[PDB]
Amino acid sequence: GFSLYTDDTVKAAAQYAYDNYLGKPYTGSVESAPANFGGRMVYRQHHGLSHTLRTMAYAELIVEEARKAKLRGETLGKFKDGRTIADVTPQELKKIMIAQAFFVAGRDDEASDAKNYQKYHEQSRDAFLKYVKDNESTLIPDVFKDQEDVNFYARVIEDKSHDWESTPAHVLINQGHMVDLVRVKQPPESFLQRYFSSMQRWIGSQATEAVFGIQRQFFHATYEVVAGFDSDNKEPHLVVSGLGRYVIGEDGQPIREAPKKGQKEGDLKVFPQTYKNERLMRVDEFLKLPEIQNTFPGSGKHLQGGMPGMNEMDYWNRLNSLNRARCENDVDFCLKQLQTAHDKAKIEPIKQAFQSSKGKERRQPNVDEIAAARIIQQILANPDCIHDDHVLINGQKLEQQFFRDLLAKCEMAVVGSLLNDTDIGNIDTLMRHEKDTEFHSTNPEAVPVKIGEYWINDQRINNSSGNITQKKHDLIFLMQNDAWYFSRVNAIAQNRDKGSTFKEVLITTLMTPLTSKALVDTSQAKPPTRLFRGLNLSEEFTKGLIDQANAMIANTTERLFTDHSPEAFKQIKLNDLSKMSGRTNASTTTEIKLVKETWDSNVIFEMLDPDGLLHSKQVGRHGEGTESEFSVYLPEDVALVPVKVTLDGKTQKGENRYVFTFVAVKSPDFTPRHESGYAVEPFLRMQAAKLAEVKSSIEKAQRAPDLETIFNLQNEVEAVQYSHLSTGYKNFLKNTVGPVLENSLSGLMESDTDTLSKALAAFPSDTQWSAFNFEEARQAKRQMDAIKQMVGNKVVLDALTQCQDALEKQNIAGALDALKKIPSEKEMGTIRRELREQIQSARQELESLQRAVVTPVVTDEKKVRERYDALIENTSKKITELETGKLPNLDAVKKGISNLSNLKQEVTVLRNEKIRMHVGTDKVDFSDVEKLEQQIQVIDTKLADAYLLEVTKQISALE
Amino acid sequence: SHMQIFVKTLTGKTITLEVEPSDTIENVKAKIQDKEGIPPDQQRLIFAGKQLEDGRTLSDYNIQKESTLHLVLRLRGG
Amino acid sequence: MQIFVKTLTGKTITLEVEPSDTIENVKAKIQDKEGIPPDQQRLIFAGKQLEDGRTLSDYNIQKESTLHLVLRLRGG
Amino acid sequence: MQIFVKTLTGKTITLEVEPSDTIENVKAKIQDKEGIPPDQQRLIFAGKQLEDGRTLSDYNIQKESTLHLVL
């Protein structure tokens, strides 16, 4: 529970140091000049408040990354006793920091000369001793153990001896002190290699890269310069161990001296004053050395100094501003800055682990969700189709599993966006049709209640108006008030229910999108930044959660040079806790008091929602004294990734309370893979049947083909040539009507083809017939109309049949194409208002074609690919390392087996990734993971026989 | 033997006539005279795009039972 | 018998009752004390909700114990 | 001399012999008893494996003791 940025005791100490020593003008002589930043005065710009505070922050950081390192399978550097930096306790750490405040408070001048050094450290340890002595009554009982302790740390501040690495405290304070020199010492590449190598001995490589990475952010947060790192830097390499140089002479080779058994031996350190044809060794030469190329991650790498996003002029402007001065003056401010920096550096790497997201808004619906919403609406509209174990619509039976699938795959908030106030209203019709029983999930020794009756009586007693808005609020109320309802609902939605009824499953499937819709409509309150969730969990399960969360925290680190992202990725895919909050309208609160005291929960989920992802909606009134509850349907691409797990107090029942703080991260790497067609296909069958009845009805109602009619009108066309009627009418029947009859006859006689569809279009309009006065033109026209319908019925029939043939093969587009074919009124119009049904189905498919298929591999094909390669090299390296595993005893076999298990899961991660980045239509290529899996098999059996052998030897030794 | 055939008009009336082969066209026009009061002098009879002259018999045109004929009024001429 | 009730506001109200009789009566006592209507208030004890009409004797409520009062209300 | 051979499965087979050299030869004798093949069977006593071709006596192997052999 302890931290620098929160503990007021540490802050008190630092404030003291500022008030009495650090904020006081330099009582020195050389380079004791005061500094002016932005027109505000700071007396110690090199060793002021920002310095010491940053060093305490370094202590926090290095301890954190050390513990992360130990949480990974790593083995940190042991001291005299078996302790590592990752064994530093919060109280010990507090002592270390309180000491660290005064470490530079005993300074007068800036001089570096040894006597001034001893003197200033004398004054420093004295300052510390004074401060401790004064507040002895508060510290000595609980902060410290005894004056022995404070003497230890004071002795560390004194540094009379030149020892720096005897204990954790020593390393932390001294290294934490000197590493702050990165911002001022150049060349950078020289120092950074030195400090890095010095920290790697104790904490490890990755944790060190994390340290210096976050350190850059600490410099940015306190407005000090950020050193660049140039691998091609051609300034002279400064040997930082003492002040010295590396010299190459004659043949472009450095000065060396052979020993006893080195072959070529250690570079000779030539002091910065050398009279030498010989030449100095540059930075890049130093980095390219074979010694520094397998030990230093920065070899070949580059770090852009300054601020990314601005030019060095206005960056310089940022360096010389009021915030620099306030940083060196205001304590609470400096601590806040560093706090936000660090807390940020806990979030950004997680984002780096996964491919980026463009915008925060909710997704758009796909085919399956459109079909889902249509179905749901038809259920709400016609409750007549609801039965005991299935729902029948248009000859299609919909089991329990269908609705469970709907609950599992469909973004129910998105599906909710496609429901309307009519569907909200139809809740009444659903409940009037219903008198079925809903049960508490838990508490089987608890009352059941008829849900339909309850809802109806509730709406009648409260919303007598029938006001639809009030209906929405009432749905949300039913959600947040009555456990007999939301227990069953939230159990069924998350596939962790048992012995539930079909009625209950169905009702849940229907109520989820409606509830989310009601929420989206109702809530006009701004999306909160911090949400809390209470949980009552067994001791062991809580333990498992702590382990998983720790796995996810331990493997994500800020980047310096080497990219440790694919590992963070893999671990987060391996241990993700997000699905505990998904698939349903989760209930949360913005007040901690609710989950901590009232409900007394042993596990608390703290959800940080800064980017306003995770669109939460207010529930209920929200005044002083309310639950301040909010509802969240977790977007499928958003994950709640742990930033920290903390041990807080105990419950009222005694068990320890754990609070895990999560951070919402949106990425297409979180969208689950779902084979489409789970909802849209039965919907297409529904439409196929609905059209089938129409085609049958039309086929039977209307007359079939008589073609004497055609023949007779053609004969009459030839006959009117001798009629005395007109030139116009003769030419009209001969030239215009004649060929139309020709094509109609041809098409009707064989098949169809477009010839039919085109012929029907060739039919002269009623206006054309009207231009022929009034005569026998009418008598020819009614014949022509008889024929027109003769062909109309045929075209509609064939269009329907073709469309239906298209539906069967699931081609949703071709169906539209055919249906387009229907003549519509005029041309056809011999068909009764079952045109309604037809144009309605046309509309259903028009709507189903508005589907937005959302990409699983955005822009970062490169990031996804590179990440996969890194992942599979890492995993294969682990496996092949376990291939040559020497197993001499039983413990080794244990570790080998657990290893084998973890690898087994890693390989499946590899597999899923292979799936989700395969674009196109072909069998997925698994060739690389086949070999891996085979290796897994071999080194599984090997481990098995090794195990039974070793336990044999054990029980043998026992006798 | 005996057979019935149909004559149609642009006006839209259908007349059913009873005839045998070996009746001339002018004879058919006479039967139409009795049927619908149309003078044989103002009648044209058409069958499959062809005009029927008065002198030929039904057999020469291959007119058969249940066939259809098209009658047109050629006024201003005999 | 004496019982204590606490609220999210952080206020603690001290109440005097028998081991018996309704929850709704207890909410009524809270109403008399602090003017809060029984339709808006819910009472919890050790992470568990007390349904109306049951006796404290049923829920095994004892002397000097503490209760947690929350306010729920429909949206409007 | 009397010796016992056991397996983790829990079955006990009782065998008769006196000192012989040759891990193989002992392996040959176990081969005969129950028609079980010894292509690579392991000997542990003292919770330790016995290498090819050194005297049984070494280790103080002795009568009425119990053994556990696994392949």
Mutate to test the interface with A, among B51, B63, B70, B73 (most CBs of A within 10 A): B70
Q: Residues of B with CB below 8 A from A708's CB? A: 68
Nearest to A43 by CA among A52, A33, A51, A31: A33
- C74 and A477 in contact by Cβ < 8 A? yes
* C10–A contact, CB cutoff 8 A: yes
Chains B and D touch (3+ CB pairs under 8 A): no
Of A708, A712, A779, the CB nearest to B10: A779
Beta bridge partners of C41: C71
* Structural contact between residues A349 and A343, judged by C-beta atoms closer than 8 angstroms: no
Alpha-helical segments (H) within B1-78? 25-36
How far is CA A717 from its chain centroid?
Answer: 75
Nearest to A61 by CA among A345, A350, A348, A353: A345
Nearest to A778 by CA among A704, A827, A725: A725
Nearest to A618 by CA among A534, A522, A529: A522
- A620 and C73 in contact by Cβ < 8 A? yes
The C-alpha angle with vertex A192 and arms to A265 and A106, in degrees rounded to 5, equals 115
- Going by C-beta distance under 8 Å and a sequence separation of 6 or more, which residues neighbour residue A574? A551, A905, A906, A909
- A720 and B11 in contact by Cβ < 8 A? no
Dihedral sign, Cα of residue A488, residue A489, residue A491, residue A492: positive
* C7–A contact, CB cutoff 8 A: yes
**Structural tokens at position A255:** 């000065």
Q: Residues of C with CB below 8 A from A591's CB? A: 8
**Structural tokens at position A458:** 């509730």
Question: What share of residues in chain B are helix, strand, coil (percent, to 5)?
Answer: 25, 35, 40
Nearest to A823 by CA among A778, A780, A783, A790: A790
- In a 13 Å sphere around the CA of A330, the CA atoms on its Cβ side amount to 15
Backbone angles phi, psi at A647, to 5 degrees: -90, 110
Query: Which residues of A fall in the annotated binding site for NADH?
Result: 481, 490, 494, 496, 533-534, 536, 629
**Structural tokens at position A326:** 């306030």
Cα separation of A612 and A66, whole Å? 32
The letter for the amino acid at A838 is Q
Of A480, A594, A601, the CB nearest to C8: A594
Cα separation of A718 and A714, whole Å? 6
**Structural tokens at position A705:** 């083909």
Give the residue carrying structure tokens 């904020």. A23
Of D42, D45, D66, the CB nearest to A949: D42
Question: Coil, strand, or helix at residue A379?
Answer: helix
Nearest to A701 by CA among A843, A839, A833: A833
How far is CA A840 from its chain centroid?
Answer: 40
* Closest CA–CA distance from residue A723 to any residue of chain B (Å): 6
The C-alpha angle with vertex A381 and arms to A378 and A384, in degrees rounded to 5, equals 90
* D47–A contact, CB cutoff 8 A: yes
* Structural contact between residues A578 and A634, judged by C-beta atoms closer than 8 angstroms: yes
**Structural tokens at position A393:** 């619509």
* Structural contact between residues A84 and A70, judged by C-beta atoms closer than 8 angstroms: yes
* Exposed e or buried b per residue across A848-864, where buried means at least 16 C-beta atoms within 10 angstroms of its C-beta: beebeeeebbbebeebb
* Structural contact between residues A143 and A95, judged by C-beta atoms closer than 8 angstroms: yes
Nearest to D6 by CA among D45, D38, D56, D54: D45
- A955 and D70 in contact by Cβ < 8 A? no
- A722 and B46 in contact by Cβ < 8 A? yes
Q: Within 10 Å of residue A291's Cβ, how many Cβ atoms?
A: 10
* Exposed e or buried b per residue across C37-60, where buried means at least 16 C-beta atoms within 10 angstroms of its C-beta: ebebbbbbbbbeebeeeeebeebe
Domain count, chain D: 1
Q: Residues of D with CB below 8 A from A948's CB? A: 8, 70
- Going by C-beta distance under 8 Å and a sequence separation of 6 or more, which residues neighbour residue A751? none
Beta-strand pair D66-70/D42-45: antiparallel
Question: Coil, strand, or helix at residue A955?
Answer: helix
- A621 and C7 in contact by Cβ < 8 A? no
* A776–B contact, CB cutoff 8 A: yes
Q: How many residues does chain D have?
A: 71
Nearest to A713 by CA among A695, A734, A696: A734
Method: X-ray
* Structural contact between residues A2 and A94, judged by C-beta atoms closer than 8 angstroms: yes
Beta bridge partners of A825: A828
How far is CA D53 from its chain centroid?
Answer: 13
Nearest CA in chain A to B8: A716
Q: Residues of A with CB below 8 A from C44's CB? A: 598-599
Nearest to A175 by CA among A198, A150, A209: A198
Q: Residues of B with CB below 8 A from A775's CB? A: 10
Q: Supply the DSSP string of A582-622, one letter for each residue.
A: -SSEEEEES-HHIIIIIS--SEEEEEE-TT--S-EEE-S--
Backbone angles phi, psi at C71, to 5 degrees: -115, 120
Q: Within 10 Å of residue A331's Cβ, how many Cβ atoms?
A: 20
Q: Supply the DSSP string of A698-730, one letter for each residue.
A: HHHHS-----HHHHHHHHHHHHGGGSSS-HHHH
- A722 and B10 in contact by Cβ < 8 A? no
Rg, C-alpha atoms of chain C? 12
Beta bridge partners of D42: D70
* Exposed e or buried b per residue across A364-388, where buried means at least 16 C-beta atoms within 10 angstroms of its C-beta: ebbbbbbbbbbbbbbbbeebebbee
Dihedral sign, Cα of residue A887, residue A890, residue A891, residue A896: positive
Give the residue carrying structure tokens 């849940």. A508
**Structural tokens at position A131:** 């401060």
Cα dihedral: A389, A392, A395, A399 (round 10):
-40
* Structural contact between residues A562 and A297, judged by C-beta atoms closer than 8 angstroms: yes
Helix (H) or strand (E) holding B9: strand B3-9
Q: Cβ-count burial of A252 within 10 angstroms (0-12 exposed, 13-18 middle, 19+ buried)? A: exposed
Q: Is the peptide bond before A668 cis (omega within 30 degrees of 0)?
A: no
Nearest to A831 by CA among A700, A648, A659, A685: A700
The letter for the amino acid at A815 is A
Beta bridge partners of A544: none
- A652 and C75 in contact by Cβ < 8 A? no
Q: Residues of A with CB below 8 A from C8's CB? A: 591, 593-594, 597-598, 625-627
- D70 and A948 in contact by Cβ < 8 A? yes
Nearest to B72 by CA among B47, B57, A895, B62: B47
Distances (CA, A) of A523 to A360, A618, A622, A629, A642: 18, 5, 11, 12, 28
* A465–C contact, CB cutoff 8 A: no
Of A948, A958, A959, the CB nearest to D8: A948
**Structural tokens at position A675:** 């084979």
Backbone angles phi, psi at C4, to 5 degrees: -120, 140
Q: Within 10 Å of residue A261's Cβ, how many Cβ atoms?
A: 6
The C-alpha angle with vertex D44 and arms to D40 and D48, in degrees rounded to 5, equals 120
Q: Within 10 Å of residue A731's Cβ, how many Cβ atoms?
A: 13
Nearest to C71 by CA among A467, A798, A480, A799: A480
**Structural tokens at position A957:** 């030794």
Cα separation of A556 and A346, whole Å? 8
Is the backbone of residue A51 left (phi > 0), alpha (psi -120 to 50) or beta? Answer: alpha
Determine the topology of domain A8-229+305-345 in CATH: Hypothetical protein af1432 (1.10.3210)
For residue B66, what are the domain limits? 1-78
Nearest to A363 by CA among A634, A81, A663, A720: A634
The letter for the amino acid at A499 is G
* Structural contact between residues B53 and B47, judged by C-beta atoms closer than 8 angstroms: no
Beta bridge partners of C67: C5
* Closest CA–CA distance from residue D55 to any residue of chain A (Å): 20
Cα separation of A913 and A573, whole Å? 10
* Structural contact between residues A434 and A659, judged by C-beta atoms closer than 8 angstroms: no
Question: Coil, strand, or helix at residue A852?
Answer: coil
Distances (CA, A) of A541 to A76, A536, A744: 29, 10, 77
* Structural contact between residues A601 and A658, judged by C-beta atoms closer than 8 angstroms: no
Q: Cβ-count burial of A922 within 10 angstroms (0-12 exposed, 13-18 middle, 19+ buried)? A: exposed
Q: How many residues does chain C have?
A: 76
Distances (CA, A) of C75 to A418, A419, A482, A619, A761: 23, 21, 15, 7, 59
Give the residue carrying structure tokens 């602090």. C34
* B35–A contact, CB cutoff 8 A: no
Nearest to A522 by CA among C75, C45, D39, C16: C75
Q: Supply the DSSP string of D15-66, one letter for each residue.
A: EE----S-HHHHHHHHHHHSS---SS-EEEETTEE--TT--STTTT--TT-E
**Structural tokens at position A412:** 């129910």
Beta bridge partners of B7: B15, B69
Nearest CA in chain D to A957: D47
CB pairs under 8 A between A and C: 62
